PDB file of C-alpha atoms and ligand atoms in Angstrom:
ATOM      1  CA  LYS A  23      44.640 -28.036   5.978  1.00 42.45           C
ATOM      2  CA  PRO A  24      41.010 -28.716   4.915  1.00 43.59           C
ATOM      3  CA  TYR A  25      39.138 -30.075   7.968  1.00 45.54           C
ATOM      4  CA  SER A  26      38.587 -33.848   7.987  1.00 43.05           C
ATOM      5  CA  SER A  27      35.888 -33.878  10.656  1.00 44.89           C
ATOM      6  CA  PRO A  28      32.861 -31.565  11.148  1.00 46.17           C
ATOM      7  CA  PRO A  29      33.301 -28.854  13.788  1.00 47.30           C
ATOM      8  CA  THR A  30      32.638 -30.220  17.269  1.00 45.22           C
ATOM      9  CA  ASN A  31      30.836 -27.185  18.738  1.00 44.95           C
ATOM     10  CA  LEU A  32      29.948 -23.564  17.948  1.00 45.53           C
ATOM     11  CA  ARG A  33      33.292 -22.082  19.008  1.00 42.92           C
ATOM     12  CA  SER A  34      35.134 -24.427  16.671  1.00 42.05           C
ATOM     13  CA  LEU A  35      32.705 -23.476  13.944  1.00 40.33           C
ATOM     14  CA  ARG A  36      33.114 -19.761  14.422  1.00 42.18           C
ATOM     15  CA  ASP A  37      36.794 -20.341  14.722  1.00 43.78           C
ATOM     16  CA  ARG A  38      36.784 -22.098  11.384  1.00 42.78           C
ATOM     17  CA  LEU A  39      34.674 -19.480   9.638  1.00 46.02           C
ATOM     18  CA  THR A  40      37.101 -16.745  10.690  1.00 44.49           C
ATOM     19  CA  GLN A  41      40.013 -18.726   9.224  1.00 44.10           C
ATOM     20  CA  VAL A  42      38.125 -19.376   5.975  1.00 45.37           C
ATOM     21  CA  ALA A  43      36.958 -15.746   5.898  1.00 46.93           C
ATOM     22  CA  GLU A  44      40.466 -14.269   6.199  1.00 43.45           C
ATOM     23  CA  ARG A  45      41.823 -16.946   3.899  1.00 46.45           C
ATOM     24  CA  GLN A  46      39.301 -15.914   1.233  1.00 44.03           C
ATOM     25  CA  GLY A  47      39.350 -12.135   1.480  1.00 46.70           C
ATOM     26  CA  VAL A  48      35.949 -11.841   3.063  1.00 46.51           C
ATOM     27  CA  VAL A  49      34.539 -10.127   6.182  1.00 42.75           C
ATOM     28  CA  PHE A  50      33.867 -12.743   8.901  1.00 41.91           C
ATOM     29  CA  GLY A  51      30.310 -11.622   9.580  1.00 41.56           C
ATOM     30  CA  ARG A  52      29.340 -11.748   5.922  1.00 42.39           C
ATOM     31  CA  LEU A  53      30.611 -15.313   5.653  1.00 43.98           C
ATOM     32  CA  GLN A  54      28.753 -16.286   8.848  1.00 39.84           C
ATOM     33  CA  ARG A  55      25.455 -14.690   7.691  1.00 38.92           C
ATOM     34  CA  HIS A  56      25.927 -16.526   4.356  1.00 39.04           C
ATOM     35  CA  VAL A  57      26.339 -19.910   6.128  1.00 41.96           C
ATOM     36  CA  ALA A  58      23.313 -19.251   8.274  1.00 44.28           C
ATOM     37  CA  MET A  59      21.342 -18.546   5.085  1.00 44.12           C
ATOM     38  CA  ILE A  60      22.548 -21.735   3.356  1.00 43.68           C
ATOM     39  CA  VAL A  61      21.501 -23.687   6.441  1.00 44.17           C
ATOM     40  CA  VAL A  62      18.028 -22.192   6.324  1.00 42.84           C
ATOM     41  CA  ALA A  63      17.895 -22.997   2.641  1.00 43.96           C
ATOM     42  CA  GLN A  64      18.625 -26.633   3.379  1.00 44.94           C
ATOM     43  CA  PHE A  65      15.598 -26.748   5.748  1.00 48.36           C
ATOM     44  CA  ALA A  66      13.499 -25.213   2.974  1.00 49.08           C
ATOM     45  CA  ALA A  67      14.915 -27.682   0.394  1.00 45.21           C
ATOM     46  CA  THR A  68      13.543 -30.688   2.360  1.00 43.84           C
ATOM     47  CA  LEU A  69       9.958 -29.295   1.893  1.00 38.59           C
ATOM     48  CA  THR A  70       8.535 -31.193  -1.083  1.00 40.50           C
ATOM     49  CA  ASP A  71       5.041 -32.038  -2.327  1.00 43.26           C
ATOM     50  CA  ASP A  72       3.917 -35.605  -2.970  1.00 44.29           C
ATOM     51  CA  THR A  73       5.748 -35.663  -6.330  1.00 45.91           C
ATOM     52  CA  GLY A  74       9.007 -34.478  -4.730  1.00 44.81           C
ATOM     53  CA  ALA A  75       8.924 -31.079  -6.236  1.00 44.42           C
ATOM     54  CA  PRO A  76      10.146 -28.153  -4.040  1.00 44.11           C
ATOM     55  CA  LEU A  77       7.486 -26.295  -2.055  1.00 45.70           C
ATOM     56  CA  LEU A  78       9.706 -23.279  -1.526  1.00 49.78           C
ATOM     57  CA  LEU A  79      11.799 -21.304  -4.091  1.00 49.01           C
ATOM     58  CA  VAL A  80      14.329 -18.784  -2.880  1.00 52.13           C
ATOM     59  CA  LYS A  81      14.293 -15.312  -4.495  1.00 50.77           C
ATOM     60  CA  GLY A  82      15.540 -11.850  -3.801  1.00 52.11           C
ATOM     61  CA  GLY A  83      19.004 -11.059  -2.460  1.00 53.97           C
ATOM     62  CA  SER A  84      19.706 -14.478  -0.994  1.00 52.81           C
ATOM     63  CA  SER A  85      19.302 -15.955  -4.433  1.00 56.78           C
ATOM     64  CA  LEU A  86      21.716 -13.428  -6.085  1.00 53.39           C
ATOM     65  CA  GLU A  87      24.313 -14.348  -3.419  1.00 52.77           C
ATOM     66  CA  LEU A  88      24.099 -18.032  -4.462  1.00 51.58           C
ATOM     67  CA  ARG A  89      24.256 -17.155  -8.181  1.00 50.26           C
ATOM     68  CA  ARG A  90      27.212 -14.707  -8.096  1.00 49.19           C
ATOM     69  CA  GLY A  91      28.888 -15.679  -4.841  1.00 51.25           C
ATOM     70  CA  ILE A  92      29.734 -13.427  -1.912  1.00 54.67           C
ATOM     71  CA  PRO A  93      32.438 -11.342  -3.669  1.00 52.62           C
ATOM     72  CA  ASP A  94      30.124 -10.305  -6.532  1.00 51.55           C
ATOM     73  CA  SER A  95      26.794  -9.563  -4.853  1.00 54.03           C
ATOM     74  CA  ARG A  96      25.248  -7.223  -2.368  1.00 56.91           C
ATOM     75  CA  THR A  97      24.912  -8.436   1.218  1.00 55.02           C
ATOM     76  CA  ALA A  98      21.553 -10.121   1.603  1.00 51.54           C
ATOM     77  CA  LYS A  99      19.718  -9.829   4.931  1.00 48.42           C
ATOM     78  CA  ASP A 100      16.370 -11.285   3.958  1.00 49.21           C
ATOM     79  CA  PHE A 101      15.824 -15.002   3.109  1.00 49.46           C
ATOM     80  CA  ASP A 102      12.989 -14.253   0.630  1.00 49.49           C
ATOM     81  CA  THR A 103      11.070 -17.258  -0.597  1.00 53.48           C
ATOM     82  CA  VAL A 104       8.003 -18.146  -2.641  1.00 52.18           C
ATOM     83  CA  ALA A 105       5.683 -20.926  -1.497  1.00 52.79           C
ATOM     84  CA  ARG A 106       4.135 -23.234  -4.127  1.00 50.66           C
ATOM     85  CA  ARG A 107       1.505 -24.201  -1.515  1.00 49.79           C
ATOM     86  CA  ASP A 108       0.119 -22.240   1.403  1.00 45.05           C
ATOM     87  CA  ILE A 109      -0.183 -20.418   4.745  1.00 47.97           C
ATOM     88  CA  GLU A 110       0.878 -22.277   8.085  1.00 52.43           C
ATOM     89  CA  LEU A 111       1.606 -25.450   6.132  1.00 53.84           C
ATOM     90  CA  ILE A 112       4.940 -23.758   5.282  1.00 54.18           C
ATOM     91  CA  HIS A 113       5.472 -22.672   8.888  1.00 49.73           C
ATOM     92  CA  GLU A 114       4.669 -26.003  10.533  1.00 43.48           C
ATOM     93  CA  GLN A 115       6.888 -27.793   7.989  1.00 45.79           C
ATOM     94  CA  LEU A 116       9.862 -25.529   8.642  1.00 44.30           C
ATOM     95  CA  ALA A 117       9.461 -25.969  12.438  1.00 44.57           C
ATOM     96  CA  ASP A 118       9.432 -29.745  11.751  1.00 45.10           C
ATOM     97  CA  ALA A 119      12.579 -29.640   9.544  1.00 46.60           C
ATOM     98  CA  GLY A 120      14.236 -27.246  12.018  1.00 48.29           C
ATOM     99  CA  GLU A 121      13.645 -29.627  14.949  1.00 50.05           C
ATOM    100  CA  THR A 122      15.096 -32.585  13.022  1.00 48.37           C
ATOM    101  CA  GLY A 123      18.017 -30.416  11.957  1.00 47.85           C
ATOM    102  CA  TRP A 124      20.762 -30.900   9.373  1.00 49.26           C
ATOM    103  CA  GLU A 125      24.468 -31.759   9.951  1.00 50.45           C
ATOM    104  CA  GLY A 126      24.216 -30.467  13.538  1.00 48.79           C
ATOM    105  CA  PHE A 127      22.180 -27.306  12.914  1.00 46.93           C
ATOM    106  CA  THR A 128      18.735 -26.854  14.437  1.00 47.43           C
ATOM    107  CA  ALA A 129      16.297 -23.967  14.238  1.00 45.46           C
ATOM    108  CA  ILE A 130      13.263 -22.502  15.891  1.00 46.00           C
ATOM    109  CA  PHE A 131      10.839 -20.406  13.882  1.00 44.68           C
ATOM    110  CA  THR A 132       9.057 -17.453  15.414  1.00 45.72           C
ATOM    111  CA  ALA A 133       5.391 -16.920  14.556  1.00 48.63           C
ATOM    112  CA  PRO A 134       4.292 -15.586  11.193  1.00 47.36           C
ATOM    113  CA  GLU A 135       2.819 -12.144  10.749  1.00 48.09           C
ATOM    114  CA  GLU A 136       1.102 -10.714   7.627  1.00 48.09           C
ATOM    115  CA  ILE A 137       2.452  -7.640   5.897  1.00 49.07           C
ATOM    116  CA  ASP A 138       0.690  -4.836   3.978  1.00 49.99           C
ATOM    117  CA  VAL A 139       1.023  -5.225   0.174  1.00 51.37           C
ATOM    118  CA  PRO A 140      -1.432  -3.782  -2.307  1.00 53.72           C
ATOM    119  CA  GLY A 141      -0.803  -6.000  -5.305  1.00 53.26           C
ATOM    120  CA  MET A 142      -0.731  -9.309  -3.397  1.00 53.17           C
ATOM    121  CA  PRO A 143      -4.140 -10.914  -2.639  1.00 53.46           C
ATOM    122  CA  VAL A 144      -2.447 -13.248  -0.166  1.00 49.02           C
ATOM    123  CA  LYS A 145      -0.396 -11.046   2.221  1.00 48.10           C
ATOM    124  CA  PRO A 146       3.194 -12.395   2.452  1.00 48.36           C
ATOM    125  CA  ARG A 147       4.469 -13.501   5.796  1.00 47.03           C
ATOM    126  CA  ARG A 148       7.594 -12.660   7.827  1.00 41.98           C
ATOM    127  CA  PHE A 149       9.088 -14.502  10.772  1.00 41.45           C
ATOM    128  CA  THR A 150      12.544 -15.501  11.952  1.00 40.64           C
ATOM    129  CA  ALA A 151      14.786 -18.497  12.318  1.00 39.46           C
ATOM    130  CA  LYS A 152      16.799 -18.998  15.493  1.00 36.96           C
ATOM    131  CA  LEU A 153      19.644 -21.208  14.487  1.00 33.95           C
ATOM    132  CA  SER A 154      21.803 -23.371  16.798  1.00 33.18           C
ATOM    133  CA  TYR A 155      24.747 -25.672  16.111  1.00 31.53           C
ATOM    134  CA  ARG A 156      24.947 -28.702  18.428  1.00 31.87           C
ATOM    135  CA  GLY A 157      22.666 -26.938  20.934  1.00 32.35           C
ATOM    136  CA  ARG A 158      24.374 -23.561  21.212  1.00 34.87           C
ATOM    137  CA  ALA A 159      22.707 -20.493  19.656  1.00 31.91           C
ATOM    138  CA  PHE A 160      24.351 -19.592  16.422  1.00 32.45           C
ATOM    139  CA  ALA A 161      22.564 -16.891  14.376  1.00 31.95           C
ATOM    140  CA  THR A 162      19.288 -15.336  13.397  1.00 31.10           C
ATOM    141  CA  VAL A 163      17.866 -15.060   9.853  1.00 30.05           C
ATOM    142  CA  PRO A 164      14.834 -12.974   8.851  1.00 30.66           C
ATOM    143  CA  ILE A 165      12.554 -14.945   6.507  1.00 29.23           C
ATOM    144  CA  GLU A 166       9.909 -13.565   4.085  1.00 28.60           C
ATOM    145  CA  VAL A 167       7.489 -15.967   2.402  1.00 30.08           C
ATOM    146  CA  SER A 168       5.244 -14.791  -0.435  1.00 28.64           C
ATOM    147  CA  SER A 169       2.665 -16.682  -2.461  1.00 27.58           C
ATOM    148  CA  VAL A 170       2.940 -17.675  -6.075  1.00 28.15           C
ATOM    149  CA  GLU A 171       2.192 -15.136  -8.718  1.00 30.80           C
ATOM    150  CA  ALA A 172       1.402 -16.263 -12.256  1.00 31.92           C
ATOM    151  CA  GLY A 173       4.108 -18.765 -13.462  1.00 31.46           C
ATOM    152  CA  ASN A 174       6.876 -17.667 -11.089  1.00 33.32           C
ATOM    153  CA  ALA A 175       7.012 -21.112  -9.385  1.00 34.56           C
ATOM    154  CA  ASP A 176       6.478 -23.133 -12.549  1.00 34.88           C
ATOM    155  CA  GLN A 177      10.219 -23.813 -12.861  1.00 34.23           C
ATOM    156  CA  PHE A 178      13.273 -23.502 -10.766  1.00 32.50           C
ATOM    157  CA  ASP A 179      17.070 -23.306 -10.926  1.00 31.98           C
ATOM    158  CA  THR A 180      19.111 -25.367  -8.419  1.00 31.92           C
ATOM    159  CA  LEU A 181      22.112 -23.602  -6.970  1.00 33.55           C
ATOM    160  CA  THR A 182      24.986 -24.686  -4.785  1.00 34.66           C
ATOM    161  CA  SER A 183      27.554 -23.192  -2.386  1.00 34.20           C
ATOM    162  CA  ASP A 184      30.689 -24.846  -1.037  1.00 35.99           C
ATOM    163  CA  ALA A 185      30.948 -22.531   1.943  1.00 31.19           C
ATOM    164  CA  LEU A 186      29.915 -25.293   4.385  1.00 30.65           C
ATOM    165  CA  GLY A 187      32.422 -27.655   2.733  1.00 29.20           C
ATOM    166  CA  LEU A 188      35.165 -25.226   3.544  1.00 26.90           C
ATOM    167  CA  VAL A 189      34.570 -25.705   7.266  1.00 29.59           C
ATOM    168  CA  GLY A 190      34.331 -29.515   7.283  1.00 28.64           C
ATOM    169  CA  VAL A 191      30.573 -29.968   6.842  1.00 28.44           C
ATOM    170  CA  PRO A 192      30.673 -32.035   3.563  1.00 29.36           C
ATOM    171  CA  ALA A 193      26.997 -32.539   2.737  1.00 30.88           C
ATOM    172  CA  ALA A 194      25.901 -31.277  -0.658  1.00 30.19           C
ATOM    173  CA  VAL A 195      24.025 -27.994  -0.780  1.00 31.11           C
ATOM    174  CA  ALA A 196      21.383 -27.696  -3.536  1.00 30.30           C
ATOM    175  CA  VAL A 197      18.835 -24.823  -3.186  1.00 28.90           C
ATOM    176  CA  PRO A 198      15.810 -24.518  -5.507  1.00 29.85           C
ATOM    177  CA  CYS A 199      15.556 -20.898  -6.744  1.00 27.54           C
ATOM    178  CA  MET A 200      13.143 -18.784  -8.749  1.00 28.83           C
ATOM    179  CA  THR A 201      14.409 -18.353 -12.353  1.00 25.43           C
ATOM    180  CA  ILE A 202      16.007 -15.104 -13.593  1.00 25.40           C
ATOM    181  CA  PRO A 203      13.086 -13.974 -15.803  1.00 27.43           C
ATOM    182  CA  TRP A 204      10.747 -13.838 -12.757  1.00 26.29           C
ATOM    183  CA  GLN A 205      13.406 -12.213 -10.580  1.00 24.73           C
ATOM    184  CA  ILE A 206      13.851  -9.524 -13.262  1.00 23.06           C
ATOM    185  CA  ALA A 207      10.084  -9.015 -13.450  1.00 20.89           C
ATOM    186  CA  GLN A 208       9.591  -8.609  -9.705  1.00 21.32           C
ATOM    187  CA  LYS A 209      12.543  -6.282  -9.168  1.00 20.83           C
ATOM    188  CA  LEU A 210      11.544  -4.215 -12.205  1.00 22.98           C
ATOM    189  CA  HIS A 211       8.052  -3.771 -10.752  1.00 26.34           C
ATOM    190  CA  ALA A 212       9.312  -2.832  -7.301  1.00 30.40           C
ATOM    191  CA  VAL A 213      11.919  -0.311  -8.484  1.00 30.85           C
ATOM    192  CA  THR A 214       9.330   1.533 -10.574  1.00 30.54           C
ATOM    193  CA  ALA A 215       6.405   1.368  -8.076  1.00 31.23           C
ATOM    194  CA  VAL A 216       4.883   4.541  -6.623  1.00 29.31           C
ATOM    195  CA  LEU A 217       3.950   4.012  -2.962  1.00 29.57           C
ATOM    196  CA  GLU A 218       1.372   5.931  -0.920  1.00 34.99           C
ATOM    197  CA  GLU A 219       2.841   9.165   0.512  1.00 37.06           C
ATOM    198  CA  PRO A 220       2.959   7.679   4.049  1.00 37.53           C
ATOM    199  CA  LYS A 221       6.011   5.687   2.827  1.00 38.57           C
ATOM    200  CA  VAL A 222       8.344   6.352  -0.113  1.00 34.70           C
ATOM    201  CA  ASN A 223      10.126   3.978  -2.439  1.00 35.48           C
ATOM    202  CA  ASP A 224      13.716   3.482  -1.100  1.00 37.42           C
ATOM    203  CA  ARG A 225      14.609   0.602  -3.425  1.00 35.46           C
ATOM    204  CA  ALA A 226      17.476   2.184  -5.279  1.00 34.13           C
ATOM    205  CA  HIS A 227      19.469  -0.953  -4.351  1.00 35.30           C
ATOM    206  CA  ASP A 228      17.345  -2.833  -6.932  1.00 35.48           C
ATOM    207  CA  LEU A 229      19.047  -0.838  -9.672  1.00 35.24           C
ATOM    208  CA  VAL A 230      22.236  -2.692  -8.676  1.00 33.22           C
ATOM    209  CA  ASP A 231      20.522  -6.106  -8.649  1.00 36.10           C
ATOM    210  CA  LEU A 232      18.887  -5.470 -11.982  1.00 35.91           C
ATOM    211  CA  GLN A 233      22.311  -4.773 -13.515  1.00 34.32           C
ATOM    212  CA  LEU A 234      23.605  -7.979 -11.989  1.00 31.53           C
ATOM    213  CA  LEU A 235      20.652 -10.007 -13.287  1.00 28.35           C
ATOM    214  CA  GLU A 236      21.032  -8.585 -16.786  1.00 29.13           C
ATOM    215  CA  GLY A 237      24.691  -9.676 -16.659  1.00 29.50           C
ATOM    216  CA  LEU A 238      23.649 -13.180 -15.715  1.00 29.08           C
ATOM    217  CA  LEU A 239      21.220 -13.532 -18.661  1.00 28.18           C
ATOM    218  CA  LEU A 240      24.220 -13.379 -21.126  1.00 29.24           C
ATOM    219  CA  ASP A 241      22.996 -13.468 -24.745  1.00 27.75           C
ATOM    220  CA  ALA A 242      19.822 -15.460 -23.843  1.00 28.77           C
ATOM    221  CA  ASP A 243      16.614 -14.733 -25.651  1.00 26.39           C
ATOM    222  CA  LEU A 244      14.446 -12.258 -23.626  1.00 25.84           C
ATOM    223  CA  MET A 245      11.039 -13.580 -24.556  1.00 26.73           C
ATOM    224  CA  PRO A 246      10.674 -15.546 -21.279  1.00 25.62           C
ATOM    225  CA  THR A 247      11.659 -12.369 -19.378  1.00 27.36           C
ATOM    226  CA  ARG A 248       9.155 -10.228 -21.392  1.00 26.19           C
ATOM    227  CA  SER A 249       6.327 -12.693 -20.664  1.00 25.22           C
ATOM    228  CA  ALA A 250       7.189 -12.741 -16.962  1.00 25.46           C
ATOM    229  CA  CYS A 251       7.204  -8.947 -16.915  1.00 25.16           C
ATOM    230  CA  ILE A 252       3.825  -8.700 -18.631  1.00 24.50           C
ATOM    231  CA  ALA A 253       2.406 -11.297 -16.331  1.00 24.02           C
ATOM    232  CA  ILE A 254       3.629  -9.651 -13.062  1.00 25.52           C
ATOM    233  CA  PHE A 255       2.669  -6.121 -14.161  1.00 21.93           C
ATOM    234  CA  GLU A 256      -0.858  -7.231 -15.147  1.00 23.76           C
ATOM    235  CA  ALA A 257      -1.237  -9.592 -12.152  1.00 25.96           C
ATOM    236  CA  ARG A 258      -0.458  -6.694  -9.857  1.00 24.86           C
ATOM    237  CA  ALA A 259      -2.505  -4.110 -11.766  1.00 24.12           C
ATOM    238  CA  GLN A 260      -0.623  -1.135 -10.294  1.00 21.11           C
ATOM    239  CA  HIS A 261       1.408   0.742 -12.868  1.00 22.46           C
ATOM    240  CA  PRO A 262       1.476  -0.632 -16.420  1.00 21.10           C
ATOM    241  CA  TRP A 263       4.196  -2.309 -18.449  1.00 23.10           C
ATOM    242  CA  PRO A 264       6.554  -0.919 -19.819  1.00 23.97           C
ATOM    243  CA  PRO A 265       7.544   1.286 -16.904  1.00 23.44           C
ATOM    244  CA  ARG A 266       9.718   4.458 -16.678  1.00 22.26           C
ATOM    245  CA  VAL A 267      12.732   3.936 -14.397  1.00 25.20           C
ATOM    246  CA  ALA A 268      12.447   7.135 -12.363  1.00 24.96           C
ATOM    247  CA  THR A 269      14.872   8.030  -9.615  1.00 24.37           C
ATOM    248  CA  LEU A 270      13.872   9.849  -6.449  1.00 26.15           C
ATOM    249  CA  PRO A 271      15.811  12.635  -4.786  1.00 26.48           C
ATOM    250  CA  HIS A 272      17.132  10.637  -1.856  1.00 27.05           C
ATOM    251  CA  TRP A 273      18.326   7.728  -4.118  1.00 25.90           C
ATOM    252  CA  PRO A 274      21.910   8.899  -4.933  1.00 24.32           C
ATOM    253  CA  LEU A 275      23.357   8.009  -1.507  1.00 25.59           C
ATOM    254  CA  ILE A 276      21.166   4.873  -1.178  1.00 28.71           C
ATOM    255  CA  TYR A 277      22.524   3.677  -4.511  1.00 28.70           C
ATOM    256  CA  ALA A 278      26.076   4.573  -3.506  1.00 29.98           C
ATOM    257  CA  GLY A 279      25.444   2.440  -0.404  1.00 28.93           C
ATOM    258  CA  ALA A 280      24.359  -0.481  -2.521  1.00 29.71           C
ATOM    259  CA  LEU A 281      27.665  -0.438  -4.419  1.00 29.19           C
ATOM    260  CA  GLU A 282      29.837  -0.936  -1.357  1.00 34.01           C
ATOM    261  CA  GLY A 283      32.182  -3.806  -2.049  1.00 34.06           C
ATOM    262  CA  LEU A 284      31.605  -4.013  -5.766  1.00 32.78           C
ATOM    263  CA  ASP A 285      34.274  -1.682  -7.197  1.00 36.14           C
ATOM    264  CA  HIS A 286      35.686  -4.616  -9.210  1.00 35.37           C
ATOM    265  CA  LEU A 287      32.428  -5.054 -11.153  1.00 35.99           C
ATOM    266  CA  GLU A 288      31.220  -3.339 -14.341  1.00 36.42           C
ATOM    267  CA  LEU A 289      28.419  -1.256 -12.854  1.00 36.04           C
ATOM    268  CA  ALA A 290      26.963   2.231 -13.248  1.00 32.84           C
ATOM    269  CA  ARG A 291      28.749   4.357 -10.577  1.00 32.70           C
ATOM    270  CA  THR A 292      25.871   6.900 -10.300  1.00 33.38           C
ATOM    271  CA  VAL A 293      22.201   6.352  -9.804  1.00 34.29           C
ATOM    272  CA  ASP A 294      21.442   8.321 -12.930  1.00 35.94           C
ATOM    273  CA  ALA A 295      23.607   6.064 -15.048  1.00 33.95           C
ATOM    274  CA  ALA A 296      22.004   3.079 -13.344  1.00 33.10           C
ATOM    275  CA  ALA A 297      18.503   4.205 -14.148  1.00 32.54           C
ATOM    276  CA  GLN A 298      19.577   4.783 -17.740  1.00 35.42           C
ATOM    277  CA  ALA A 299      21.075   1.290 -17.846  1.00 35.34           C
ATOM    278  CA  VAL A 300      17.936  -0.261 -16.443  1.00 36.22           C
ATOM    279  CA  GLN A 301      15.698   1.728 -18.841  1.00 36.92           C
ATOM    280  CA  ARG A 302      17.612   0.491 -21.855  1.00 39.91           C
ATOM    281  CA  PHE A 303      17.201  -3.000 -20.435  1.00 39.31           C
ATOM    282  CA  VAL A 304      13.462  -2.462 -20.163  1.00 40.13           C
ATOM    283  CA  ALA A 305      13.352  -1.397 -23.814  1.00 42.70           C
ATOM    284  CA  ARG A 306      15.430  -4.409 -24.730  1.00 34.85           C
ATOM    285  CA  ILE A 307      12.909  -6.680 -22.992  1.00 36.17           C
ATOM    286  CA  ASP A 308       9.908  -4.939 -24.600  1.00 34.85           C
ATOM    287  CA  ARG A 309      11.353  -5.427 -28.028  1.00 37.49           C
ATOM    288  CA  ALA A 310      11.930  -9.205 -27.973  1.00 36.73           C
ATOM    289  CA  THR A 311      10.055 -11.727 -30.155  1.00 42.12           C
TER     290      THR A 311
HETATM  291 MG1   MG B 401      30.427 -23.936  22.319  1.00 41.85          MG
HETATM  292 MG1   MG B 402      37.863 -13.275   9.438  1.00 44.15          MG
HETATM  293 MG1   MG B 403      39.468 -22.327   7.904  1.00 44.17          MG
HETATM  294 MG1   MG B 404      16.150 -16.531  -7.619  1.00 40.55          MG
HETATM  295 MG1   MG B 405      13.456 -11.377  -6.549  1.00 42.21          MG
HETATM  296 MG1   MG B 406      22.452 -10.261  -3.147  1.00 43.25          MG
HETATM  297 MG1   MG B 407      -1.734 -25.644   1.204  1.00 44.27          MG
HETATM  298 MG1   MG B 408       7.765 -13.596  13.774  1.00 44.64          MG
HETATM  299 MG1   MG B 409       2.834 -16.884 -16.485  1.00 42.70          MG
HETATM  300 MG1   MG B 410      12.606 -26.537 -13.396  1.00 42.08          MG
HETATM  301 MG1   MG B 411      27.977 -28.865  -2.055  1.00 40.85          MG
HETATM  302 MG1   MG B 412      11.158  -7.900  -5.759  1.00 42.71          MG
HETATM  303 MG1   MG B 413      13.795 -13.571 -25.900  1.00 41.71          MG
HETATM  304 MG1   MG B 414       7.909 -17.074 -23.475  1.00 44.52          MG
HETATM  305 MG1   MG B 415       5.929  10.361 -15.872  1.00 44.17          MG
HETATM  306 MG1   MG B 416      29.921   2.963  -2.935  1.00 46.00          MG
HETATM  307 MG1   MG B 417      29.797   7.080  -4.929  1.00 46.74          MG
HETATM  308 MG1   MG B 418      22.212   1.572   0.482  1.00 48.09          MG
HETATM  309 MG1   MG B 419      24.288   6.031 -19.002  1.00 49.14          MG
HETATM  310 MG1   MG B 420      19.973  -3.886 -22.587  1.00 52.62          MG
END
């Protein structure tokens, strides 16, 4: 019933994902995108410095998928990462790892391109991973790599998934990830940012993520989160801490879109309630000692 050998080619892999997907109550494509992401994370996890410490920490939506699992998180399309060390050293090393491969997967990495960001001295970089399993093209994963900011790579959590184990690839998955305090600080800053009138802030989906991250903090002391918030808000020197969680007029339907698939969770059902929930969380953070 559980496969004893790894899949022999792509068709058998896709075929096994679909069977796991239906068996688990999940949409096939979501499961496949999640496996693609895990595979990319395993390439990133082999990148270490000369002490063995990870060079890349995953953040953003890919990280929330690994923390809460597929049923209890938004679909993540970006593989957001933070590089402890710099520039094309990260790209050349991922092309290296991708050529060597992992349990039959290989990957090619398109060329990096800078992106416009006001509060980042080093402009983050986007490119793409072209995955293949035993030769045959498998999937494509967008990747975003940003540079360290303050202490947001000082520590890391290590997260697992057994999705690959369900299709007969038994190797252990262990992905270094940015800690929750710094994930809260960066989402809080992005959801409250005012952008230049050429573009407008569409990030109502971060009101969902901030409610999920608050849930994951449990009863923990908030001083680490407050220090991370102060650090990121000062580092970036845009709006000051503590921010006001404003909603924009087009956010109601964007927020409703971000809640697809999460009816079973304890979430604000309207973007107003969500903004109120996140503002109380901001006050909670500001009060800690
Ligand atoms: Mg084939
Ligand atoms: Mg299916
Ligand atoms: Mg199966
Ligand atoms: Mg993270
Ligand atoms: Mg994040
Ligand atoms: Mg997510
Ligand atoms: Mg360097
Ligand atoms: Mg590219
Ligand atoms: Mg710091
Ligand atoms: Mg650590
Ligand atoms: Mg494992
Ligand atoms: Mg962010
Ligand atoms: Mg505290
Ligand atoms: Mg502290
Ligand atoms: Mg105001
Ligand atoms: Mg909805
Ligand atoms: Mg609705
Ligand atoms: Mg949406
Ligand atoms: Mg409310
Ligand atoms: Mg609160």
